[PDB]
Amino acid sequence: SDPSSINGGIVVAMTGKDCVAIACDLRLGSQSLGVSNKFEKIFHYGHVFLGITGLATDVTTLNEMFRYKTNLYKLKEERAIEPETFTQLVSSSLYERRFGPYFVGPVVAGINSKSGKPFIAGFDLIGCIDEAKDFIVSGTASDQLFGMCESLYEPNLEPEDLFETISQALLNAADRDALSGWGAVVYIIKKDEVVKRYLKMRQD
Amino acid sequence: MDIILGIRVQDSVILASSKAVTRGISVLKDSDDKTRQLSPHTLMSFAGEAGDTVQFAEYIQANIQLYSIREDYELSPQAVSSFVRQELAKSIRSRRPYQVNVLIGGYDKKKNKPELYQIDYLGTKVELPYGAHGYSGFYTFSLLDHHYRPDMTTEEGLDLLKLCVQELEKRMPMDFKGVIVKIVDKDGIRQVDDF
Amino acid sequence: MDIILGIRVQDSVILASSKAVTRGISVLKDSDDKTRQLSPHTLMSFAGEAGDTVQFAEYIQANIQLYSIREDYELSPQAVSSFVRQELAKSIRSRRPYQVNVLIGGYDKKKNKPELYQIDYLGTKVELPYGAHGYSGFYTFSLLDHHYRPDMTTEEGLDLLKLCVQELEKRMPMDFKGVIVKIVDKDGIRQVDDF
Amino acid sequence: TSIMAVTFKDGVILGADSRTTTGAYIANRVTDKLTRVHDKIWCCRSGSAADTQAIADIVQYHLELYTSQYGTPSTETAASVFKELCYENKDNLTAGIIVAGYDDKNKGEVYTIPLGGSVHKLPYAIAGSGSTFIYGYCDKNFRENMSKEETVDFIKHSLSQAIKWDGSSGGVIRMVVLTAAGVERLIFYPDEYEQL
Amino acid sequence: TSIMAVTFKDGVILGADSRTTTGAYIANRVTDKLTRVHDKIWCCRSGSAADTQAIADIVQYHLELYTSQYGTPSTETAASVFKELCYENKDNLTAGIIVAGYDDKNKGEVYTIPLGGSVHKLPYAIAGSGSTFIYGYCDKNFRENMSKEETVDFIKHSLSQAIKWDGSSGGVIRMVVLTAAGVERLIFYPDEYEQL
Amino acid sequence: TQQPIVTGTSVISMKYDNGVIIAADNLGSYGSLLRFNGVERLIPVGDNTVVGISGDISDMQHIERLLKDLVTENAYDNPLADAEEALEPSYIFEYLATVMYQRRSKMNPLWNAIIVAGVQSNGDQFLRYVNLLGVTYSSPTLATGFGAHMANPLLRKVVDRESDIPKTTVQVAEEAIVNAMRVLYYRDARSSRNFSLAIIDKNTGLTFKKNLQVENMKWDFAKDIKGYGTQKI
Amino acid sequence: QFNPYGDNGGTILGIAGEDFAVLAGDTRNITDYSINSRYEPKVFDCGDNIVMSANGFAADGDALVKRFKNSVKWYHFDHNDKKLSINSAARNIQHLLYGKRFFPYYVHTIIAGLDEDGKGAVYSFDPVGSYEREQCRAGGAAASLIMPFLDNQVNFKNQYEPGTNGKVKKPLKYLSVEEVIKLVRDSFTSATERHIQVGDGLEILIVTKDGVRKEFYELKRD
Amino acid sequence: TTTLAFRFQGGIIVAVDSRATAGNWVASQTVKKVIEINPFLLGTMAGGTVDCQFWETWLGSQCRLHELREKERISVAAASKILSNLVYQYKGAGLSMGTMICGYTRKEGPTIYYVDSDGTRLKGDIFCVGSGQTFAYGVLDSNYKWDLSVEDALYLGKRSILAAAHRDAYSGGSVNLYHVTEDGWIYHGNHDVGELFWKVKEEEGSFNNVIG
Amino acid sequence: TTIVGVKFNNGVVIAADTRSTQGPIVADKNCAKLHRISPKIWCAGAGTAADTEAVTQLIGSNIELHSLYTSREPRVVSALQMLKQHLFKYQGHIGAYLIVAGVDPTGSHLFSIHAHGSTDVGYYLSLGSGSLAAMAVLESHWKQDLTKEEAIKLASDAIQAGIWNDLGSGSNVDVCVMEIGKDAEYLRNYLTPNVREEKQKSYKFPRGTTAVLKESIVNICDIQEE
Ligand SMILES: *[B]([O])([O])[C]([C][C]([C])[C])[N]C(=O)[C]([C]C1=[C][C]=[C][C]=[C]1)[N]C(=O)C1=[C]N=[C][C]=N1
Numbered sequence A: 001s002d003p004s005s006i007n008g009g010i011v012v013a014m015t016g017k018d019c020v021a022i023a024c025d026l027r028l029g030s031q032s033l034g035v036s037n038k039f040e041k042i043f044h045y046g047h048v049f050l051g052i053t054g055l056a057t058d059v060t061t062l063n064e065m066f067r068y069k070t071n072l073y074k075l076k077e078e079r080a081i082e083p084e085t086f087t088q089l090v091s092s093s094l095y096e097r098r099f100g101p102y103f104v105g106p107v108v109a110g111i112n113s114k115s116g117k118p119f120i121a122g123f124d125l126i127g128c129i130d131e132a133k134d135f136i137v138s139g140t141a142s143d144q145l146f147g148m149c150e151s152l153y154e155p156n157l158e159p160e161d162l163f164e165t166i167s168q169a170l171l172n173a174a175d176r177d178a179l180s181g182w183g184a185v186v187y188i189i190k191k192d193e194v195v196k197r198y199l200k201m202r203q204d
Numbered sequence B, C: 001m002d003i004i005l006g007i008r009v010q011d012s013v014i015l016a017s018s019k020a021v022t023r024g025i026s027v028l029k030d031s032d033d034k035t036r037q038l039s040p041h042t043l044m045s046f047a048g049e050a051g052d053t054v055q056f057a058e059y060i061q062a063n064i065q066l067y068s069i070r071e072d073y074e075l076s077p078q079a080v081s082s083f084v085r086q087e088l089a090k091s092i093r094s095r096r097p098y099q100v101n102v103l104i105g106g107y108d109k110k111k112n113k114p115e116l117y118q119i120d121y122l123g124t125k126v127e128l129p130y131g132a133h134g135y136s137g138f139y140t141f142s143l144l145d146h147h148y149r150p151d152m153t154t155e156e157g158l159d160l161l162k163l164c165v166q167e168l169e170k171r172m173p174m175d176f177k178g179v180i181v182k183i184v185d186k187d188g189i190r191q192v193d194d195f
Numbered sequence D, E: 001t002s003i004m005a006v007t008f009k010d011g012v013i014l015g016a017d018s019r020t021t022t023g024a025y026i027a028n029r030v031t032d033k034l035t036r037v038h039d040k041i042w043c044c045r046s047g048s049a050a051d052t053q054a055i056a057d058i059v060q061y062h063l064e065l066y067t068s069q070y071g072t073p074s075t076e077t078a079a080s081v082f083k084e085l086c087y088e089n090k091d092n093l094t095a096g097i098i099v100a101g102y103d104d105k106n107k108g109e110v111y112t113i114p115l116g117g118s119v120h121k122l123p124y125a126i127a128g129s130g131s132t133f134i135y136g137y138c139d140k141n142f143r144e145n146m147s148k149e150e151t152v153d154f155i156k157h158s159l160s161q162a163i164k165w166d167g168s169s170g171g172v173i174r175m176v177v178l179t180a181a182g183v184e185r186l187i188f189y190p191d192e193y194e195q196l
Numbered sequence F: 001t002q003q004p005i006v007t008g009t010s011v012i013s014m015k016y017d018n019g020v021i022i023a024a025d026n027l028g029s030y031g032s033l034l035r036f037n038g039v040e041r042l043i044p045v046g047d048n049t050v051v052g053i054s055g056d057i058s059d060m061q062h063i064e065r066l067l068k069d070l071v072t073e074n075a076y077d078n079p080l081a082d083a084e085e086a087l088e089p090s091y092i093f094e095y096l097a098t099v100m101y102q103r104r105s106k107m108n109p110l111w112n113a114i115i116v117a118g119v120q121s122n123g124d125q126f127l128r129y130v131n132l133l134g135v136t137y138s139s140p141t142l143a144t145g146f147g148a149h150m151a152n153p154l155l156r157k158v159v160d161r162e163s164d165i166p167k168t169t170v171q172v173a174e175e176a177i178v179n180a181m182r183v184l185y186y187r188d189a190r191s192s193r194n195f196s197l198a199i200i201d202k203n204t205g206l207t208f209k210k211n212l213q214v215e216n217m218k219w220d221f222a223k224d225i226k227g228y229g230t231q232k233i
Numbered sequence G: 001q002f003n004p005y006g007d008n009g010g011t012i013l014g015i016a017g018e019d020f021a022v023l024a025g026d027t028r029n030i031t032d033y034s035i036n037s038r039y040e041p042k043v044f045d046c047g048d049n050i051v052m053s054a055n056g057f058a059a060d061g062d063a064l065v066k067r068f069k070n071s072v073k074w075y076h077f078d079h080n081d082k083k084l085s086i087n088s089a090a091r092n093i094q095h096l097l098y099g100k101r102f103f104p105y106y107v108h109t110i111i112a113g114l115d116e117d118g119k120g121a122v123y124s125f126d127p128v129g130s131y132e133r134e135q136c137r138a139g140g141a142a143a144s145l146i147m148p149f150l151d152n153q154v155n156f157k158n159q160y161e162p163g164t165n166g167k168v169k170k171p172l173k174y175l176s177v178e179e180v181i182k183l184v185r186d187s188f189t190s191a192t193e194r195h196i197q198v199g200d201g202l203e204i205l206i207v208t209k210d211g212v213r214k215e216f217y218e219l220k221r222d
Numbered sequence H: 001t002t003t004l005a006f007r008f009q010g011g012i013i014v015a016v017d018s019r020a021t022a023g024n025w026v027a028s029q030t031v032k033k034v035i036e037i038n039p040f041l042l043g044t045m046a047g048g049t050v051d052c053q054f055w056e057t058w059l060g061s062q063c064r065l066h067e068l069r070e071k072e073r074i075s076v077a078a079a080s081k082i083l084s085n086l087v088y089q090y091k092g093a094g095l096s097m098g099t100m101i102c103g104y105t106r107k108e109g110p111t112i113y114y115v116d117s118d119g120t121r122l123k124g125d126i127f128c129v130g131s132g133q134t135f136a137y138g139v140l141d142s143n144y145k146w147d148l149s150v151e152d153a154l155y156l157g158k159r160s161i162l163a164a165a166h167r168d169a170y171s172g173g174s175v176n177l178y179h180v181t182e183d184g185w186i187y188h189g190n191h192d193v194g195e196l197f198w199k200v201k202e203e204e205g206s207f208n209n210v211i212g
Numbered sequence I: 001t002t003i004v005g006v007k008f009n010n011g012v013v014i015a016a017d018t019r020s021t022q023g024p025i026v027a028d029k030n031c032a033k034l035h036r037i038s039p040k041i042w043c044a045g046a047g048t049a050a051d052t053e054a055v056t057q058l059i060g061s062n063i064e065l066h067s068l069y070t071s072r073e074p075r076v077v078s079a080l081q082m083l084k085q086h087l088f089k090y091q092g093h094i095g096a097y098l099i100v101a102g103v104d105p106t107g108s109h110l111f112s113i114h115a116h117g118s119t120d121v122g123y124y125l126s127l128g129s130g131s132l133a134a135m136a137v138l139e140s141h142w143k144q145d146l147t148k149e150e151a152i153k154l155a156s157d158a159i160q161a162g163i164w165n166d167l168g169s170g171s172n173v174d175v176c177v178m179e180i181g182k183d184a185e186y187l188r189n190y191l192t193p194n195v196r197e198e199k200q201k202s203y204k205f206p207r208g209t210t211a212v213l214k215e216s217i218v219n220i221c222d223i224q225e226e
């Protein structure tokens, strides 16, 4: 009945020293029934990464919508959109559906190509921007993720250390949520290289 | 309607769909074909609310047939599935949404690969080796999880499908009057007349 | 539970009762005997809410068995049916009523006549040549109205009963996993093991 | 309903309208809402007619039995018996009662018992649907130790306004005077009090 | 809310409390409920603060545009513009407005517009939750052709009682005097009006 | 299950170095109607305890009678009723707390919020809360209804934790309480200007102050406030 | 309509060591968006080297603890001052809770102590009396924030040994009392940051063969 | 929850999962869903937590009292009926139970009774109960035979719970196995699904849909 | 949420806490609730966070165009009128509860706005779940003719009352001072009385602790030449 917890799923993002990390589970369900273990929730438009939790049809629809908009942006501007600018575009796009909203929990992550500054941001289903220095959480196990991140996190972690922290935050949060799990992916993002790692986790 | 199944093997996609149509108290028909050919190498099965199912299926069929004539070219299963998803994703926020779930089985002639797409009435699309809608998956997925291997032959796929139907006929309360099975491969679409 | 039928012929009463037990989504059992022997020449089939059915049937069984021992005498089917009706008529105005419908088939050894009584959970009793509870009558009564003749033999009664079950298996949405058939006559109660 | 009780120099006076309504229909235009539970302990009734009659009948019974054993009861005692019934049966009752009585030791006393079943001893009390419209007037015009004639005028003018504005109030203005001299009934008709 | 407007010999005076409540919390204790739609046409507002502000703003706009085309509007005209908004939008509005104004030809006039959107021309008008408690007092104490000082006392005493009994009313008593001489604002604090 | 009819608003209280202070206004409201203006809602029990009650007044009067009966009963066959075996604040509270929870458990609650303030035999300050649900808690400052939202923030600036209690005199504590009562009169639509205050000190005993009034009120600034935005006159 | 239940917030945490056990809980008590008390003890010494906390609706919480303490008293009277073992206390509490199965004590109960072999023990209860011995359990408001952290840092879940890459798990080495208290303090500090009903103070009760000891720590008061 | 029990040549296999959930929140992964009523009788747990715990421990007290009074082991039929008659008294009040009472006696042999909080009491050979019952039925029905070895029967039960643990969101944690003979039940360990899944996948060649 | 506004001698000051909450969870610990409508007109917002942001931006945008159209610096009454009429039209569904303050050629101003479109004038105001705690402090300590230093102190003390006593408010105090004939100074994190203490332990993991299935480089660059 509650649109935001029909399909299930989670996303988490973190900042480190000259790097950012964004991670998600791979589950798609119909309430109790597990349907797919390959439903990735992180997308990227140029160097800007976007994770989206919530109702799966809207996750897909919004990805297609932002691909659409960032492609037109690039043709007109003659440059790739930056994380700060994209964050504003997500907020604008969600709020235009104020009274008929997409049931989603987006998360932006990336490094500004000019300043080199790491950036993350979160949103509610209707556009409000949460721009945290440390971390952002989203999805059906957001409470769990808040608890993990708040204890595990420390500032200025090196890329390979940050990987371990965000991975352990996701995995242990997902294992305390019935509608999350069935696999996981972690993106480590530096100024001009991005590594993608699939994690081994329990499949129940 | 009730049960629709799909499985993708080495060189084909197999769709199985129940024959029963029930209007409340009586079973009005026991030979109903819950499927439409969208293009020579793409088949769509469907299940949902009465009327809406056929109305939606035929509407999609007409649109794909129109595209085929205009361009003198068959759309890929991936392209057709995306078109169908968008129509349902549009539909869900309409005045009166289409209450229809579909499976799209197609053989991509460019990549020489079979492809199975599962889409629900919300517009939730996933590519799968095997899929189902409604309560069908609750009985059958445990068998498919055990037996499916991705290099099966079409004959092995039909045997695994028989095992699924047998479990459904044992544990489901409703009598769905058997299934019509159809195979989609490089040569097109054909119906298995004895199942 | 689901389907319970009854037919009174020349020299016997025949009760047919489905074997399926369904707990919502799954069919937990396909060999369930929805009947209790109240006395050597009296059989009661039952259908209604889970738990209440067996609880009521066994409670009646215990009471009739108690009467038999106390008096060293078998009550007439008419007497047993009246006792059962009163228990249900008492039940309907209780805190939590028995949600149980029953058929009572018995052979009266005094009058040398078979007798079939239909009683619903309200305590509504009627003596009939043939009867049913739930939706069973909706399919079967038209066939019984046509073919039933009261000088029928037991073999003719079973054939007419097969025709009823075949219609149910064709037009009912639910799979009731066949029926257990039992015959009540001057020699007592026996089960037809092949049906 | 518009009811009130007012203490004054010589004792206490109870006042009431005479209208009983079933919705907008006046079921009785000459009702007696001033009722006697003892010789010089009376009450004004508002709310359900059935409830307040049932209560008043029980109280009269209790005080009659009290009198036979312990002599004349105080007004405070009468109010307590009313309270005990109204409080303990608050869930099933709709009764707003004013209790008024005259002792020789305590002189005139007034106790008001609203819906909840609480007791409030006051110099004067107002109640009923029509009382809402005269809180301002009564507060401005009440004085302690008024004369009989002044108190009759105060009640007559007050209930006149309550009747004027409240649809649930009307008919004649009944009054009952309680003093050492005895018990006096008064009645005032529309032609008299409407021109005030 | 306790609001009232009273005509007198030299014109008309508007009066109001200053309390705005969200349930039992007083969201503003120094509210100005006397609002200006034209130089010598003002109104008292009760009901929804949002609705009555939205209406008053629209009316001021209409009368400003009327003035630019046809000169000074009558008080009756202002009341009609209020009515048109309140009546036609009765389903979506909760607004009880009193309109008061001073012409030289018509002198002081008062129009009351209750919930429905009906118009009633009166010598004086009372409204708001607290008005219920002073129907009796105001009816007994109002006279036509009072002096300025008498009318100020009448409003001060009336609203004092309304404030005393109504929880939704309180704070300071604001008043606005409308005469040929001009527009005068008056304020009266709790220490003054509570001891009346 | 019932609904409250005639109701009493906030009760506020705090601890100080040698005892406790408690206060509550004298109003009995009937919905939005400010019906009864002379209602005492602080009820002393002996010379060492004051019970402050808010909520339904009929239920308050019942509790008042229970406490009156409790004193009578304690005196029975008790030569030390006015000495070692006198009623303590802790005894009075626990009794009420028992009754409140029992009544909510029968789905027929006494619709009240209660604060028991007092001083124990050994001089220790006692201050504890209980309500219609049987919920109990203690704190250096306690308040009911609107007092919880408005009084506590002010009183907690004086005594923020346990270690602030010895540092707080009776003059400073009373000042804070009286100020809180003024704030409640500004902002609570079901409050009155008239209130009662009670001090229970381990040295000077029980001081019960009646007929107090809120004074030193700021209203003059109201004259400058005009319209709701754009209006100038 | 009258609602006999309420929510007083708070959060509790029990951890069983090798020869000790801790039961911690914040000292904040609330209703809705208001603070009732910054220091209202929630974890209690019930005698016989058993500590208990019933978190949720405080009225039901106090009633239950009161009745269990009473049960310990009468267990001594009826059975010759025999020490009530932790497993026996647990079973007794189930019957106290199930007694009100159809009008439940709206609480999450946790008890801690030592078993009859001297090893650390923690038991956890739902409102209607189902119970289970556990090594680790958080209860109350911020339980969903704390438990995943304890799965990771106490039971070393999803942790493996470097170099082996997922093949060899991190071995389950025992934790000292000093090490557990560190994890308890960090759990509550983290919970305080992200949960509005958690804060003010932390009170820990430590149970060993020597008896019951207490420790108190300040938490953020916002 | 997924719980199963089935009759075969070697007696009865009982297999259950370990997960408990409050909404989407995973409350526990270490729940003992098999109750040891005595050395000879087992009960499974499904539905609401306490009801099945409380009343099946209570059932053990009644069985102990029976054999104290009658100097003889209680029959599975009699033990199951004590529980079913008890819950029938509470029918409507809101109890939530789905259980299998499993035992092995001389007069009956291996016996399983499905008992239910609506009052249902059914004797049978195979039963699956819980939110993941349909998934477990699939594996059982296709692989079940009477002539199964104790080793193979144990594996089938383990595998059927795994099937449900994978697909059903409200099932998982670990698998508890029991084998019931005439001389009593025998515990066959706790098996973590996290480790069991990867092991079975590799060795059995199943779950090719999942990447490992 | 606790937001306040306080008038003083030569201007006006507004303040706010920095906590945002979804139910009983804190979504952001250092949230920014002071919004800029124009250079010298700022407002604080309570209620639905997307709404207070969106309605401020829209009116702030239109105020900027209006200022360019008229060649005049914007007025607070213009922002007030545009905000109230917008909110009234949406019948309360846009959940924005605002305290609007600023300086303009007319002088210094302070207003409140509620979601249904009603406005109020005052020397001191407070909004949000902690408005009662704040208003208690304001009613106790406010006087006429406050200085700049006194008004900042009073404003932040009122927010602190909300921070400590209201569970809907917390973390830090943001302030914005708008004095006549001066630039508006925005004091982000004016007070920081809620820094988290050092943790007992470091939870930095040994490298290789997490099990990995696959690795791959992601192509973020465009299609390459040659
Ligand atoms: B008075 O209006 O409260 C009046 C007092 C009663 C004792 C005679 N009550 C009634 O007239 C009531 C209705 C009512 C009106 C207003 C408030 C509360 C109740 N009438 C009756 O109880 C009644 C009506 N018709 C027949 C019998 N009883």
Ligand SMILES: *[B]([O])([O])[C]([C][C]([C])[C])[N]C(=O)[C]([C]C1=[C][C]=[C][C]=[C]1)[N]C(=O)C1=[C]N=[C][C]=N1
Pocket (backbone or CB within 6 Å): E001, E002, E019, E020, E021, E022, E027, E031, E033, E045, E046, E047, E048, E049, E050, E052, E128, E129, E168, E169, I114, I118
């Ligand atoms: B008065 O009490 O009617 C008053 C008049 C208003 C124009 C200031 N109304 C209010 O105080 C209303 C509530 C109300 C009370 C009684 C009757 C009808 C309405 N208040 C509001 O509209 C309000 C409250 N808080 C914030 C904003 N608006």
Ligand SMILES: *[B]([O])([O])[C]([C][C]([C])[C])[N]C(=O)[C]([C]C1=[C][C]=[C][C]=[C]1)[N]C(=O)C1=[C]N=[C][C]=N1
Pocket (backbone or CB within 6 Å): G126, H001, H002, H019, H020, H021, H022, H023, H027, H031, H033, H045, H046, H047, H048, H049, H050, H052, H130, H131, H170, H171
């Ligand atoms: B199982 O999933 O049925 C399980 C069995 C129980 C004995 C541990 N039940 C639960 O976990 C239930 C939820 C549920 C899920 C699916 C079907 C039926 C029930 N849990 C609870 O009832 C519950 C209640 N309070 C706290 C935690 N869990």
Ligand SMILES: *[B]([O])([O])[C]([C][C]([C])[C])[N]C(=O)[C]([C]C1=[C][C]=[C][C]=[C]1)[N]C(=O)C1=[C]N=[C][C]=N1
Pocket (backbone or CB within 6 Å): A123, A124, A128, I001, I002, I019, I020, I021, I022, I023, I027, I031, I033, I045, I046, I047, I048, I049, I050, I052, I128, I129, I168
């Ligand atoms: B305060 O409590 O009014 C605060 C002010 C806001 C501008 C930061 N409100 C919130 O934080 C609201 C509370 C709320 C919760 C649920 C519905 C409506 C309002 N929170 C949010 O708007 C919010 C919550 N999660 C993410 C983003 N925004």
Ligand SMILES: [Cl-]
Pocket (backbone or CB within 6 Å): D031, D032, D033, D049, D053
């Ligand atoms: Cl009468």
Ligand SMILES: [Cl-]
Pocket (backbone or CB within 6 Å): E031, E032, E033, E049, E053, F228, I119
């Ligand atoms: Cl206003």
Ligand SMILES: [Mg+2]
Pocket (backbone or CB within 6 Å): C118, C119, C120, C124, C125, C126
């Ligand atoms: Mg019948």
Ligand SMILES: [Mg+2]
Pocket (backbone or CB within 6 Å): D163, D164, D165, D166, D167, D168, D169, D170
């Ligand atoms: Mg009249």
Ligand SMILES: [Mg+2]
Pocket (backbone or CB within 6 Å): G221, G222, I162, I163, I164, I165, I166, I167, I168, I169, I170
């Ligand atoms: Mg706070």
Ligand SMILES: [Mg+2]
Pocket (backbone or CB within 6 Å): A203, A204, H164, H165, H166, H167, H168, H169, H170, H171, H172
């Ligand atoms: Mg699972």
